[PDB]
From a paper:
In eukaryotes, genomic DNA exists as chromatin, in which the histone octamer, composed of histones H2A, H2B, H3, and H4, wraps about 150 base pairs of DNA into a nucleosome. In cells, more than 10,000 DNA apurinic/apyrimidinic (AP) sites are generated in genomic DNA each day, by spontaneous depurination/depyrimidination and the base-excision repair (BER) process. To this end, an AP endonuclease (APE) specifically incises the 5′ phosphodiester bond of the AP site1112, and removes the AP site in coordination with the BER pathway. To elucidate the structure of the nucleosomal AP site, we reconstituted nucleosomes containing an AP-site analog, tetrahydrofuran (THF).
Author numbering:
A (entry chain G): 10 to 118
B (entry chain C): 12 to 118
C (entry chain A): 38 to 134
D (entry chain E): 37 to 135
E (entry chain B): 25 to 102
F (entry chain F): 17 to 102
G (entry chain H): 29 to 124
H (entry chain D): 27 to 123
Amino acid sequence: ARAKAKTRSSRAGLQFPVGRVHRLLRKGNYSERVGAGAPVYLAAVLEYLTAEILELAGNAARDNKKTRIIPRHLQLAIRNDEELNKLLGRVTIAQGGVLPNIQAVLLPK
Amino acid sequence: AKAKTRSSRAGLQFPVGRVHRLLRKGNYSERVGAGAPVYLAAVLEYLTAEILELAGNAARDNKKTRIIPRHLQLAIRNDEELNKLLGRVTIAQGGVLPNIQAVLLPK
Amino acid sequence: PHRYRPGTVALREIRRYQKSTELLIRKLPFQRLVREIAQDFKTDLRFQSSAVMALQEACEAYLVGLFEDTNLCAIHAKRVTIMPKDIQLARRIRGER
Amino acid sequence: KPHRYRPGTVALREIRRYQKSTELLIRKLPFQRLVREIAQDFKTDLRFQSSAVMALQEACEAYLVGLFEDTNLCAIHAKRVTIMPKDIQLARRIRGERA
Amino acid sequence: NIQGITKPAIRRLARRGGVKRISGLIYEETRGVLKVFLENVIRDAVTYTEHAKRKTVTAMDVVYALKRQGRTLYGFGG
Amino acid sequence: RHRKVLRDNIQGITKPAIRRLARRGGVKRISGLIYEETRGVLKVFLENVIRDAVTYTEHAKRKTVTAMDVVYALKRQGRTLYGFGG
Amino acid sequence: RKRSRKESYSIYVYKVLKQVHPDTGISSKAMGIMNSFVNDIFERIAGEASRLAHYNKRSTITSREIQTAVRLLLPGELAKHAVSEGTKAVTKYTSA
Amino acid sequence: KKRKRSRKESYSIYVYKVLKQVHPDTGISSKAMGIMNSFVNDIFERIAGEASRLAHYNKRSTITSREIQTAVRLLLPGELAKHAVSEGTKAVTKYTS
DNA sequence: ATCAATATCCACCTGCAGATTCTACCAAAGTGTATTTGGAAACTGCTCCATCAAAAGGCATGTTCAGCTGAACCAGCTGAACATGCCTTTTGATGGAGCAGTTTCCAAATACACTTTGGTAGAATCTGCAGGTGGATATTGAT
DNA sequence: ATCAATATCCACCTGCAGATTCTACCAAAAGTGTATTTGGAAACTGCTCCATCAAAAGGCATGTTCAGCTGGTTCAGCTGAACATGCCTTTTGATGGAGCAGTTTCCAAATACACTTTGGTAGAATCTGCAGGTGGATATTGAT
Ligand SMILES: [Cl-]
Ligand SMILES: [Cl-]
Ligand SMILES: [Cl-]
Ligand SMILES: [Cl-]
Ligand SMILES: [Mn+2]
Ligand SMILES: [Mn+2]
Ligand SMILES: [Mn+2]
Ligand SMILES: [Mn+2]
Ligand SMILES: [Mn+2]
Ligand SMILES: [Mn+2]
Ligand SMILES: [Mn+2]
Ligand SMILES: [Mn+2]
Ligand SMILES: [Mn+2]
Ligand SMILES: [Mn+2]
Ligand SMILES: [Mn+2]
Ligand SMILES: [Mn+2]
Ligand SMILES: [Mn+2]
Ligand SMILES: [Mn+2]
Ligand SMILES: [Mn+2]
């Protein structure tokens, strides 16, 4: 008789799905074989980046006094963060708009 | 029966078996159809022919019987579509096209 | 009667639209355009509504970014007015033309 | 007399001459030393195939020439014929190399 | 239909882009450029559609086409 | 043994070399402040390519940077280079 | 008949959102952005890992290929913290 | 005392064959040939990658001459796409019979 | 409108470093046989897409003028051209560091059978938002 | 720089409709247990080709003169901003039905392995453009 099933994600201390990520790795034709630690490492990295973006975007959403993050807040957070901006430099967030910016020379006086 | 290469059956100069092997071992999909390497081999042969055509011309314009990377460059860059296809590519030892902005010429 | 000095309402408009995220082209002209262009490639096509929305999101974000660059090119030539030549300089440096 | 060309004549002559040739324009040894210094700041005791160094030098010089064409276009845009740091910066900014 | 992208629309796009003053020739230039962009994306989205043997262009066709053009879009299924 | 300490080598990229590069680029007149900008820009470019090449080298558990490491680095930086393998 | 069964990362993104900002929720369109994001970084890393293995004439993608791929793909501090989180997760998993 | 050596493949022979077809009189330097090998590998990987993504989007596990054809349409500009589809379709129909 | 003073151009040679041809192994392609299976092809649900007609509401249009751009003029000064003096890079051998070729044995992978969780879809919440206001902030013009 | 005088923007409320969260089933899928296989790490070690050095070979650094480029200044033509109104296009919101998409089913076509040639590669052995050296012809530039 089998023991009580423990998800790999829980074994890894993660919220993101290690099992799914492993499946996706196996079925995406990236290689013949996928090592046991690879989906754990990748799931952890995905979770980290998701957390970073949600950290900054939550700050953005409640500094403008909302309790729900909307795409605008994601844009504000990505673009105001140099490294995220770099990572997503060739990406458009739908309904995100732009950062407030007027070239100084365009101002009066 | 007497062995006939796939390239010969398809009428190609490029190696169909090789292209098949490279498709199977490159992890592009679980399976590769029998027709995929023929088509791809033919397309590679074609683009090679197009580029060697234009560069042979560049070479005979420079009065050379042998193609050098400069001729490949001249051929790619003077041709709108190859230039577009290789728009993000550097030809080593290829140089650039003669071009001087008009405003820089003497009055 | 009241009149704002030329340029005041412009700056106000910059602030207004940089503060918002709504699409700036009217839906229907845009869609009719999408369908014309497509029909030059493939006929008796239909479009999901989301497909058209994605094309418009893409178009507007591209045009907004291109206008930012164009404006940098105008500022560069010591003007504050963008011109076709600015759009072309931006596009040629971007490797688009 | 003694002979002297007007400023710009030899410059245009040099453009024709270097656009006509394909040889690398940076001297080999200095470029090598730069490559090894940078690399050594990433990882120590590295060696290089000479092909590796040549490949870096072809890539660098091609990049710098292309950036100089764009820079020149920005100068010409501002009604000048002299390239300046502000031109290189406008070129890199539009290229999305800096932002 | 390209004339349907009106002077005020293009003006708003330019305003979000931070542009303060606009030459009158901009609008036609802008229309040309938008048309080239759309042709480029739509040609690929439609290629994807015919490949899937459909007659309806789906959001994914547009998203994949955008990803090929180096214009990745988040929020429509990819 | 070991070689002598490499310092300040970006300065070995001389004013005449930068001038020739600019000439191939079609540049007629050159401000005196260009030479430092160019050096700066060059170093960024190199730092960026060499970093990736070395990552590939380290991954392959080698001590020698190969032409392929450089070519893969270039290809991922969107600067594909023809003529050195692959 | 039944429509398809669609997977997405929504539930996990939500869990992370709650860890970091217990007070804050998220719009469905925002959730779509975040989904697109996870899929995109996923594919970038896995693709880099795939090429790494092919260059080195290897048929297995291990946590090593993933790590090198992370170093290649992420800028600076983001790369450092991702490599740290990754190694941490693998270690915890291994011991457990 | 026992001895060691190895074998590397390239497209040289085939490029040379094509060169003789289009320019019987002309030869080619080894560096030029290196450029051409890079070219064949580059286009190869681009087409195969486009075909891979294509097959994946459409839930298909086999890459056929059809995926290759679509990938070729996606990657090549205009007339090149036309002539490549011609050469490919021709090669395949010839092969099949 | 001419001459010098230079620079580039453009054949012509000749030898050898680099390209082509030649052979001989063996690395892989082709053939043959047997076994699994992916994905058209066909047959219908049911999503949403195209259409259409009566709502709103933004744009087209034409006129006044603020001020931006582009021209014209000019002086300060910066960067090109060049002659000089010699330090740095290129070139050629060559031992040996370290890739790369081989072999082999496990840690780590797959293969197969069997048995909680993510997705889904109404119900039950709750928060932005649409709409309205008035105070806040900003701009314009006359002293 | 101040005051008025407007004009527009932006917090601040409010109620409640719609979007989010909440609940509770249920197949699909992730996990577990056991059995085998196997890709590749590690260990040796042949054999390329890298680092090194010092004599050659050859540009770079340096300072001075001044041509002409840049940037400042002024100013009027005229272009593009602002603005006010009713017509015409866009928006909104029901419908019928086109065609994605869900299910299922079998065969053409895929993979896998063995067996046997055969095209491709790696030097070896020739072969031959063209690099590099020169010199004379023609072109171009800049000073009178
Ligand atoms: Cl692993
Ligand atoms: Cl096929
Ligand atoms: Cl213009
Ligand atoms: Cl400057
Ligand atoms: Mn250092
Ligand atoms: Mn089946
Ligand atoms: Mn030796
Ligand atoms: Mn050793
Ligand atoms: Mn078994
Ligand atoms: Mn659950
Ligand atoms: Mn409101
Ligand atoms: Mn009231
Ligand atoms: Mn066995
Ligand atoms: Mn083995
Ligand atoms: Mn003067
Ligand atoms: Mn006036
Ligand atoms: Mn029907
Ligand atoms: Mn034979
Ligand atoms: Mn010569």
